[PDB]
Design a protein around this ligand. Structure first.
Ligand SMILES: CO[C@@H]1O[C@H](CS[C@@H]2O[C@H](CO)[C@@H](O)[C@H](O)[C@H]2O)[C@@H](O)[C@H](O)[C@H]1O
Ligand SMILES: CC(=O)N[C@@H]1[C@@H](O)[C@H](O)[C@@H](CO)O[C@H]1O
Ligand SMILES: CC(=O)N[C@@H]1[C@@H](O)[C@H](O)[C@@H](CO)O[C@H]1O
Ligand SMILES: CC(=O)N[C@@H]1[C@@H](O)[C@H](O)[C@@H](CO)O[C@H]1O
Length: 606
């Protein structure tokens, strides 16, 4: 189609399938294997990217150009890597991925949305689609084109350190919240074929349904462990939302560290190829988890040759190496040169990678848009996060007896009020894991509004607000307080660090609640990734709210405390009476909850 030096795959007007086929047919084996290779920015240089024809880069959790980097800094980093990739013989742009799982959460100044369990509590799939839209904008503000989200794990045991990354123990809720996908990627066209990848263009990102499959079903909630369940249960609980994701054009699927009945997912041809590819008709690319192939073996990494063989034959398309690229590339090249892995399997992997890249517009817009930088932390997106935080809150108690005056909503005008607790003025604690650092952090780690700041911003000018982190009982009783707001709960955690068999909050937390509530009427705000042992906290408190991990916009919490909006959240998980009950999910035969799934008290706006 005209010009003497015309190359079909570089023609934007051509159908994606024709561009993929035209490009594939030109590639060397080294070029093909390079597309299948994703490396950490920590090991990337221009020469590495060029010499090894690398297909993708990622930032893992906390992998940043520097602490406090601006949006432009991120764009410059990503474009530097892109220029190197575009300088190869074939000029195939890399795709850059990141965990933007509650906003663009590694980035300083990014809006931090509530974690998934609180989103589950909202029962509001359109809110979650809007959050996807806003997240895509803030990811593209940093030049990144690919988010490792949503986690559609169905967490069946809150002892799991990733339970907060699951919208619910009820697959139907998880299914509903697959609306994240068209928020991130754009809505699919009317004609769309389920399982095809889709991204609308340069203001959207590729998504990733993760972690396939049964990551939420592991024995005793042990992260990365074995999900012991028959096929019927895997298909009825852990699988459904993947089909919703196909329907919505999810571009990629990331495989789980976990096993299913003792078979590593990263080596499970029947499920990756037989089921996802051949039965759900997924036509995007399948990515490993981080050193996922290494972990096929015990010890991990003890037979990398086998790891490469087993994962690639199972049907994985792109390997998140992410550091030992030369070992990966060499081993895979050897397996193809030896006939162990057929060229058909390489060609399938590369077709799928390229299909996503061309579909998303990455050949047409391989570089960042400077005008998008101001999307980062944009006030409209904070307003959305504040809405989401407020909707996520579940009111568990609002009065010690049935005849007490309800404590919430609180008056904004009172002579003096107390705000207390470890979690009242700690932004990192309110955001939880996957915020700035992999495992989250403590203190003022980003731009946001703590619960204390929110209270000060809400109350009448005549209202004196006193903060005490851990006041003793005498301080409370002598203070002349009208009421207290006391916030306590879990410290930030992620993945195996958060696996927890006792589910009791750290001290001082209960002791602070008891000291405060013993002296003045109190509303307790519980910050957690999951249900935790809560009867002691309830017994002390006039009112108690499960605020989950609400993110950067602490005014969402005060919007409900002070009655600007009513409480509407409902539990998206069972609240257990004791951890000896676990696992215990809605619908089980022996179901004896403290609070059932769907529980939540309400208030009316004042
Ligand atoms: C301890 O090493 C750290 O692990 C984290 C999480 S592992 C894995 O990482 C993927 C890519 O970031 C996620 O999409 C996935 O959900 C995770 O299970 C990794 O992020 C750090 O880069 C690594 O240092
Ligand atoms: C399939 C799998 O991941 N199984 C692991 C097992 O190998 C390990 O020894 C144990 C440690 O508690 O947790 C579980
Ligand atoms: C009361 C109690 O035993 N708390 C422990 C705590 O040391 C740890 O943070 C957690 C995760 O393993 O398990 C629990
Ligand atoms: C404090 C308060 O106003 N509670 C009310 C309740 O009486 C009423 O039935 C409901 C629906 O209108 O709104 C709520």
């Amino acid at each position: 189609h005209h010009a003497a030096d015309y190359v079909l795959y570089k023609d934007a007007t051509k159908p994606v399938e024709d561009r993929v086929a035209d490009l594939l047919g030109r590639m060397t084996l080294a070029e093909k294997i390079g597309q299948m290779t994703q490396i950490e920015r920590l090991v990337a240089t221009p020469d590495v990217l060029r010499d090894n024809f690398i297909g993708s880069l990622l930032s893992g959790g906390g992998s940043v150009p520097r602490k406090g980097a601006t949006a432009k800094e991120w764009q410059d980093m990503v474009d530097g890597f892109q220029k190197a990739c575009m300088s190869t013989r074939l000029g195939i742009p890399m795709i850059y991925g990141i965990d933007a799982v509650h906003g663009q959460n590694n980035v300083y100044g990014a809006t931090i949305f509530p974690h998934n369990v609180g989103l589950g509590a909202t029962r509001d799939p359109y809110l979650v689609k809007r959050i996807g839209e806003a997240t895509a904008l803030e990811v593209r503000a940093t030049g990144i084109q690919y988010a490792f989200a949503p986690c559609i794990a169905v967490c069946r045991d809150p002892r799991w350190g990733r339970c907060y990354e699951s919208y619910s123990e009820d697959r139907r809720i998880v299914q509903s919240m697959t609306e994240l996908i068209p928020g991130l990627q754009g809505d699919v066209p009317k004609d769309f074929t389920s399982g095809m990848p889709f991204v609308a263009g340069k203001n959207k990102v590729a998504a990733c349904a993760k972690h396939f499959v049964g990551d939420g079903g592991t024995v005793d909630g042990i992260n990365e462990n074995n999900t012991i369940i028959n096929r019927e249960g895997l298909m009825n609980i852990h699988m459904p939302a993947y089909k919703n994701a196909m329907d919505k054009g999810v571009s990629t699927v990331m495989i789980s560290y976990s096993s299913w009945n003792g078979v590593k997912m990263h080596a499970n041809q029947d499920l990756v190829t037989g089921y996802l590819k051949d039965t759900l008709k997924f036509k995007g690319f399948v990515i490993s988890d981080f050193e996922g192939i290494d972990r096929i073996t015990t010890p991990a990494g003890s037979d990398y040759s086998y790891s490469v063989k087993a994962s690639i034959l199972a049907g994985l398309d792109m390997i998140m190496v992410p550091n030992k690229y030369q070992q990966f590339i060499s081993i895979l090249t050897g397996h193809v040169n030896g006939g162990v892995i057929p060229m058909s399997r390489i060609d399938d992997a590369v077709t799928r990678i390229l299909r996503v890249k061309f579909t998303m517009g990455l050949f047409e817009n391989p570089y960042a848009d400077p005008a998008m930088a101001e999307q980062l932390g944009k006030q409209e997106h904070r307003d959305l996060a504040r809405e989401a935080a407020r909707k996520s809150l579940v009111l568990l108690k609002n009065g010690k007896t049935s005849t007490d005056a309800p404590l919430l909503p609180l008056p904004k005008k009172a002579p003096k009020i107390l705000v207390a607790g470890s979690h009242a003025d700690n932004l990192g604690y309110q955001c939880g894991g996957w915020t700035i650092e992999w495992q989250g952090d403590t203190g003022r780690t980003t731009v946001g509004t703590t619960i204390l700041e929110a209270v000060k911003a809400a109350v009448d000018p005549s209202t004196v607000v006193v903060f005490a982190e851990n006041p003793d009982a005498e301080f409370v009783k002598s203070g002349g307080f009208s009421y207290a707001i006391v916030a306590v709960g879990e410290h930030p955690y992620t993945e195996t660090k958060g696996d927890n068999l006792n589910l009791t909050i750290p001290e001082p937390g209960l002791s602070t609640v008891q000291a405060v509530c013993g002296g003045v009427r109190c509303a307790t705000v519980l910050i957690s990734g999951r249900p935790v042992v809560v009867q002691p906290l309830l017994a002390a408190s006039d009112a108690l709210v499960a605020a989950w991990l609400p993110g950067s916009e602490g005014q969402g919490v005060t919007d409900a405390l002070f009655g600007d909006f009513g409480f509407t959240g409902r539990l998206p998980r069972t609240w257990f009476k004791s951890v000896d009950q676990l696992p215990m999910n809605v619908g089980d035969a022996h179901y004896d909850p403290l609070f059932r799934l769907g529980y939540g008290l309400t208030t009316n706006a004042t």
